Subunit: 87 residues, 2 copies
């Protein structure tokens, strides 16, 4: 993945076409409450790695946080531009 926007396109595609094999689809189907839960937990994990783990370890956790953030966006029907206009 080369951009934040490439990831979003890919996740949106999963949301649309609903591949049976997709953990993304399951997560969307699990609903917003569970998505917020996951996002928060991952924030904690990012903090843990920020203080105690290697760059590689932190990059991994940050990548997961970004993932859940975009899944959350999709579940509430937010576009990239909806967020991008606020940055």
């Amino acid at each position: 993945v080369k951009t934040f926007e490439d990831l979003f396109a890919e996740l949106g595609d999963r949301a649309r076409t609903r591949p049976a094999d997709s953990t993304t689809v399951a997560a969307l189907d699990g609903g917003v409450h569970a998505l917020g839960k996951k996002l928060l937990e991952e924030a904690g994990e990012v903090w843990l790695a920020a203080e105690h783990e290697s760059n590689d370890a932190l990059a991994e956790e940050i990548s997961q946080l970004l993932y859940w953030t975009q899944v959350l966006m999709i579940s509430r029907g937010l576009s990239l531009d909806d967020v991008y206009r606020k940055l």
Copy 2:
């Protein structure tokens, strides 16, 4: 801002030139413990907005979470590639 990548370049520029007027610069200087705390707190505010606020308010909180995520990246010396390669 036309990207996550635009913002990251902007924040890197602030880290490089250290403009006196920037709250970003103060955040960088305070170190990683305060940054993780801010990130976790924002993750909470994202969850609050996901369950109980309008798309516009949610987009706002998400913009802030992404800001704090990038500031953390810059603090620890992670590149976009470092994160994206794990996506």
